[PDB]
Design an enzyme around this catalytic site. Structure first.
Site, mmCIF file in Angstrom:
data_model
loop_
_atom_site.group_PDB
_atom_site.id
_atom_site.type_symbol
_atom_site.label_atom_id
_atom_site.label_comp_id
_atom_site.label_asym_id
_atom_site.label_seq_id
_atom_site.Cartn_x
_atom_site.Cartn_y
_atom_site.Cartn_z
ATOM 1 N N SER A 210 -7.386 -94.179 -75.277
ATOM 2 C CA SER A 210 -7.098 -95.156 -75.229
ATOM 3 C C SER A 210 -8.301 -96.183 -75.719
ATOM 4 C CB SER A 210 -6.284 -95.910 -74.293
ATOM 5 O OG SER A 210 -6.124 -96.975 -74.508
ATOM 6 N N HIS B 107 2.180 -92.788 -73.101
ATOM 7 C CA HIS B 107 1.192 -92.248 -73.100
ATOM 8 C C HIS B 107 -0.007 -92.617 -72.154
ATOM 9 C CE1 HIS B 107 -2.522 -94.998 -74.518
ATOM 10 N NE2 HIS B 107 -2.783 -95.495 -73.897
#
Ligand SMILES: O=C(O)[C@H]1O[C@H](O)[C@H](O)[C@@H](O)[C@@H]1O
Ligand code: NA
Ligand code: NA
Length: 370
Positions: free
Chosen positions: A214, A351
């Site tokens: 990320s 995610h």
């Protein structure tokens, strides 16, 4: 939605036809462009008063499997100077055979103590899912990590650590428009960690895989692009301003990231809020700056915020630069990595950074580092 600039067309329209023109003319152009317009300029490399202090060394960590070092990397000689804390696990089997171990190096989100439950690390283990430390060690790799907040807070309402304070104070009341933000500071800290690895006789600093998840994968990409000492670069689900194409305006957009995270990029990057059509670069050219060194970009199928298709299309749009060096990118289907030195996969689910992500990264590193 907007056409991508051609990585092989210089700022004056000259076509780049070979790797020598790329390395010596087009690469510095793009680095300056990303510095000025996206991440901000890195204002220093190695500080002259950097000091390394091994504060703890444990020869039988994790039941005997690893030697564990905790290292204070201080950036001035005054013992009160700003510093960051590097945690290093080295597989004892590799030490035992008198080899310097290859290294996975990356920043963490919640603190060195969260990567494993190891109660001696100076909320413990609470981020273990993203850090399969024993499995990396068992595969013969050292694991090095630093908390991103030692260098700059993650959230705009975070507390400053001594390094963030020093840079914050230096920024006066406001940053210059082309001055760096958190992603640049994070990338810089990764290169300082590599500086330490060069001095540690237990690890092979010529075989370092710099990775991030990320926002810290945005930083890993920017670190690998600027610092060609890194052997291999891994971007896990880095999304907007990392591997995803800004000009696709899908999921998180430039205006959304600059609004929620105004300290992450240069102030100049805010000029592209809802104006991605005007960007003179896009993230395929950041991927290209890693060539010819191996680069792994990966997505999650349900992670629409990161724009997985934009991440894959950035990989494809960077492939012609890798092809200048005779390397190959992806030709994909879920759970099927694709590409040679330039590799991509997309996994099912949300995610995150999973065991299967790491299985793919370890196999990749085996090919290129072992
Ligand atoms: O970190 C991680 C992610 O955190 C947030 O979702 C942010 O909006 C993303 O841009 C970032 O990549
Ligand atoms: Na070393
Ligand atoms: Na996006």
């Amino acid at each position: 939605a907007y056409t991508l600039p051609d990585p092989l067309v210089g700022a004056d329209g000259t076509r780049v036809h070979d790797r020598a023109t790329w390395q010596h003319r087009r690469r510095p152009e793009l680095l300056q462009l990303f510095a000025r317009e996206v991440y901000g300029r890195t204002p220093l490399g190695r500080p002259e008063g950097m000091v390394f202090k091994v504060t703890t060394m444990e020869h039988a960590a994790l039941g005997g499997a690893a030697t564990r070092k905790e290292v204070t990397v201080r950036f001035g000689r005054d013992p009160n100077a700003p510093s960051m804390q590097l945690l290093l696990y080295v597989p004892n089997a590799v030490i035992a055979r008198a080899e310097r171990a290859p290294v996975f190096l990356g920043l963490n989100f919640y603190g060195n103590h969260t990567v494993h439950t190891d109660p001696a690390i100076a909320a413990r283990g609470s981020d273990a899912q993203k850090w399969p430390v024993e499995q990396i060690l068992a595969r013969g790799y050292a694991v090095a990590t630093v908390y991103c907040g030692d260098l700059c807070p993650d959230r705009p309402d975070g507390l400053n650590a001594s390094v963030a304070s020093w840079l914050d104070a230096a920024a006066g009341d406001q940053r210059a428009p082309d001055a760096w933000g958190a992603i640049g500071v994070w990338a810089w800290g990764l290169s300082r960690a590599l500086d330490y690895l060069e001095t540690d006789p237990l690890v092979d600093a010529s075989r370092v895989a710099v990775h991030g998840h990320s926002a810290l994968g945005k930083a890993a990409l920017w670190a690998g692009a600027q610092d060609d000492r890194f052997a291999l670069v891994i971007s896990n689900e880095s999304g907007c301003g990392g591997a995803a194409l800004s000009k696709r305006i899908h999921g998180e957009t430039v205006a959304r990231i600059n609004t929620v995270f105004p300290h992450w990029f240069a102030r100049n990057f805010r000029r592209y809020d809802d104006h991605e059509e005007a960007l003179p670069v896009d993230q395929h050219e950041l991927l290209a700056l890693v060539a010819p060194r191996p680069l792994y970009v990966a997505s999650a199928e349900d992670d629409d915020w990161a724009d997985p298709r934009g991440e894959f299309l950035a990989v494809k749009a960077a492939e012609p630069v890798f092809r200048l060096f005779g390397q190959t990118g992806p030709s994909p289907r879920v759970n099927e990595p694709s590409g040679g030195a330039l590799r991509y996969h997309i996994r099912p689910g949300p995610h995150g950074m999973t065991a299967q992500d790491w299985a793919f990264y370890l196999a990749f590193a085996d090919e290129w580092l072992k």
